[PDB]
């Protein structure tokens, strides 16, 4: 739906070399407002967006406290887990966590989610009815049972349906300029002869927000998921994204190829053709 607040935790064990690395990140839609890194000077929750800097010192102190609380939970979790799966003390292992809420175009609660992985694998996810867990294996049933006793989901339902939305709403208001804007992709096309009898047509989308886009090639109006090269979307740095999609054509036959571009910033999709 129209708006989403997510939080991303990674903890990485380093056995020979001290306490696990912990990195927390918060996101409103495709925008990063806060960051904690255990290997960084300040040892504080730091801003990364203009519309969060205005928040008072009660905000930062809180977050710093709670985020250190989170890293301390994760530090235990790497112990318990290594044990559950009986892994040696020798190896690095990764815990990843992701929670937050989506709201819809009226900014009422759409949906909650709270997902946990170990070593890049689904371990335990809270189900969309926000009452029950999905356990990926029988290490993870142990945990589920543990969290069923400790009535965990009940206390997550409180935050996801309440505080999560109510501060999502807040971050949208205080960042109206940035968070509610849509940047249409600026489109052009380039040519590069490749082979004596071949060119490449690279169709470009630049400076778009949010990050959801679709670029397709047609030959004579018939779609070509064939013969094409599509780079995964990527941040400009400046809070906008870029994408390109290339097909390689038989030279003299460029005019036949059209690249088509969808984004919510476009009412009617744009068709672009090679045109010196």
């Amino acid at each position: 739906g129209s708006h989403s607040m997510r939080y991303f935790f990674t903890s990485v064990s380093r056995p020979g070399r001290g306490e696990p690395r912990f990195i927390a990140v918060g996101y409103v839609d495709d925008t990063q407002f806060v960051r904690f890194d255990s290997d960084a000077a300040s040892q504080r929750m730091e801003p990364r967006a203009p519309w969060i800097e205005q928040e008072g010192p009660e905000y930062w102190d809180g977050e710093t406290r709670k985020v250190k609380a989170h890293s301390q939970t994760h530090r235990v979790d790497l112990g318990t887990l290594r044990g559950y799966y009986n892994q040696s003390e020798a190896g690095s292992h990764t815990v990843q966590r992701m929670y937050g809420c989506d709201v819809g175009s009226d900014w009422r609660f759409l949906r909650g989610y709270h997902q946990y992985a170990y070593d890049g694998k689904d371990y335990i996810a809270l189900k969309e009815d926000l009452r029950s867990w999905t356990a990926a294996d029988m290490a993870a049933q142990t945990t589920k049972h543990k969290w069923e006793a400790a009535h965990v989901a009940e206390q997550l339902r409180a935050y996801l349906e309440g505080t999560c939305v109510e501060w999502l709403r807040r971050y949208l208001e205080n960042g109206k300029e940035t968070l509610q804007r849509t940047d249409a992709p600026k489109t052009h096309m380039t040519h590069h002869a490749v082979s004596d009898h071949e060119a490449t047509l690279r169709c470009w989308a630049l400076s778009f927000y949010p990050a959801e886009i679709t670029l397709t090639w047609q030959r004579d109006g018939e779609d070509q998921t064939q013969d094409t090269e599509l780079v995964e979307t990527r941040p400009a740095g400046d809070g906008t994204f870029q994408k390109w999609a290339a097909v390689v054509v038989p030279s003299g036959q460029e005019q036949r190829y059209t690249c088509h571009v969808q984004h919510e910033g476009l009412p009617k999709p744009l068709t672009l053709r090679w045109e010196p």
Binding site: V67, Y84, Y116, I124
Partner: peptide
Amino acid sequence: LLSXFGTPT
């Protein structure tokens, strides 16, 4: 805003 609940597996 972050949770107040530390979820040890």
